[PDB]
Amino acid sequence: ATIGRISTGSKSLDKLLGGGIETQAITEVFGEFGSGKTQLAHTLAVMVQLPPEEGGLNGSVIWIDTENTFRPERIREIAQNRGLDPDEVLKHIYVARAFNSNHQMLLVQQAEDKIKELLNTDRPVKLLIVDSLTSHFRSEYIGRGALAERQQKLAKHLADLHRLANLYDIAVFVTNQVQAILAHSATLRVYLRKGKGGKRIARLIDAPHLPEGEAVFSITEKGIED
Ligand SMILES: Nc1ncnc2c1ncn2[C@@H]1O[C@H](COP(=O)(O)OP(=O)(O)NP(=O)(O)O)[C@@H](O)[C@H]1O
Ligand SMILES: [Mg+2]
User: Fold this and answer.
1) Tell me, what CATH number does 115's domain have?
2) Residue 207 carries which DSSP code?
3) Residue 37 CB–ligand 1 contact under 6 Å
4) Could you tell me if 177 and 32 are in contact, meaning their C-beta atoms sit under 8 angstroms apart?
5) Radius of gyration for the alpha carbons in the chain, expressed in angstroms and rounded
């Protein structure tokens, strides 16, 4: 029942997060296009595989991809440059493409099967990524009355995700795109934005009991880092 933390690769962002993203929680990253949401997801999918003294949880990953932006070679590069075996690392990421929102919801039920299978093995699932949490919902639920219906379906989907996080001690990491779609209650919302000089800036939103500064990071051949 203790909480585990997965390093993001950035010391700056890790400090903002209290050491990394938490198990038994849904962390939502949100921001405009190009703000680094997907690159952070890729980095986390490598970092979680590290031992705990290196910031990981010796864990496997389930990834629900909605817009086909998962890149196996980016995983390999990030792994390679952090001293891990690129091919081994891919072996422990289980990617499924969600065709629509209803399929996305079914894939969360299927994730529980994979989770159970690995639970008391040496590489339990420790990270579940949904990229994008909201893209299908934005496309499908549109027009008069759609706000209530969309928020309703999303809340149920997030409830499924919360259950998996808490029941199996897993960090859930979801993405959400904004044009400068309420994610019910993610545990923690992190706003990402592009800054000058190729830097990215992160800020915690509506978290008055947590740090109020901003983290600054780059996107490199190691994925995310200061
Ligand atoms: N291999 C790489 N090495 C370094 N930087 C990279 C690499 N791949 C992507 N990037 C950077 O990452 C940016 C895209 O980040 P990404 O994480 O895809 O944004 P995003 O928030 O997911 N965009 P969107 O899905 O449209 O809402 C690119 O514009 C590059 O600046
Ligand atoms: Mg993306």
Assistant:
1) 3.40.50.300
2) -
3) yes
4) yes
5) 16
